[PDB]
Design a protein around this ligand. Structure first.
Ligand SMILES: CC1=CC(=O)CC(C)(C)[C@@]1(O)/C=C/C(C)=C\C(=O)O
Ligand SMILES: CC1=CC(=O)CC(C)(C)[C@@]1(O)/C=C/C(C)=C\C(=O)O
Lengths: 191, 186
């Protein structure tokens, strides 16, 4: 039941001035109860596109393939809509052939720009994976840009280290953030 | 392989490189094997790209999923040199011993093979070349990276290349990013 002393160290991807405005956001959405057989992390990605552009992409639970790599396809239900509890099936691109991922939408607030999900089924090391992602705007005496924060807590596999598990998860997440920043800086530049 | 332009290349570029593909990116692939060629155009000078592509000891400088790369103590950056690589994936136990096969600093060609280690995709062989291209002014580099890999039992030719293609395109993106950033910072 131990917390996650998280808002005390800069995530790479964030200058110090930005890590100030987000102290409260990090403590509110990106701190977890991790202690027994679990690990967690927070990653940051600076996007140079308007915040509504970013959130319009970030919010689509049904098209994660739009900003994450390694997704052959995502299937939602016909009787589904963009709401907490809706389920999506993800076909993964990996070394094995029949690798799917059943994920449940846990959070989705179109006014605080908060979203999050959990992995409820499918074959993988990352067991009991749960993620929260928030979107923030920044205005540095002038330019104005978005900041995306993504955190997770995940059951560390047995025999697999804490580092090797976060190290992998960090990389997956960092690269999707890079992808989102590009898809969205690409809608923005053309405006 | 020439039955499709590599994604990342227009036709004017696939023409100038036909000879280079046939000379360096063609493989002896039969059943239980698959091969692909990816292209990434980098907007940095060719010596800038090549200086990074050629470091057989620092693959992490342009590749994802690398916890650490170890060379030999007597690092002769030479054909036959070995590098032992820990990969970040589904376990802390994904290893790869890799041999340097080719290295022509004159043709800007390098290449390696995976000779040992634990992973599903065994007998991986890859080549990388670098080229300069010029369409109506603007000179840019083109990086071609090809491979052949023994496809596992139960994994289709699509499902295997789809995965291997992804890693390569992504390492290609990173290299374009590292080198265009070296160019801009100079
Ligand atoms: C790449 C991959 C491999 C696995 O073994 C688990 C799972 C299939 C869930 C995953 O898609 C992981 C996705 C993660 C960590 C984050 C996301 O999607 O934002
Ligand atoms: C990380 C990993 C996982 C696999 O399943 C295949 C293999 C073991 C070959 C690999 O090292 C892939 C290496 C690739 C694609 C390129 C390289 O090294 O330039």
């Amino acid at each position: 039941t131990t917390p996650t002393t998280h808002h005390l160290t800069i995530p790479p991807g964030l200058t110090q001035p930005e890590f100030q405005e987000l102290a409260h956001s990090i403590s509110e959405f990106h701190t977890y109860q991790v202690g027994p057989g679990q690990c967690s992390s927070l990653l940051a990605q600076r996007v140079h596109a308007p915040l509504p552009t970013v959130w319009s992409v970030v919010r689509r639970f049904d098209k994660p393939q739009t900003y994450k790599h390694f997704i052959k396809s995502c299937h939602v239900e016909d009787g589904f809509e963009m709401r907490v509890g809706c389920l999506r099936d993800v076909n993964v691109i990996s070394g094995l052939p029949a690798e799917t991922s059943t994920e449940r939408l846990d959070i989705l607030d179109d006014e605080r720009h908060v979203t999050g999900f959990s992995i409820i089924g499918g074959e993988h090391r990352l067991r009991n994976y749960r993620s929260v992602t928030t979107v923030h705007e920044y205005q540095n005496h002038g330019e104005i840009w978005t900041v995306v924060l993504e955190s997770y807590v995940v059951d560390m596999p047995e025999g697999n280290t804490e580092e090797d598990t976060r190290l992998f998860a960090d990389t997956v997440v960092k690269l999707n953030l890079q992808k989102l920043a590009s898809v969205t800086e690409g809608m923005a530049r053309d405006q």
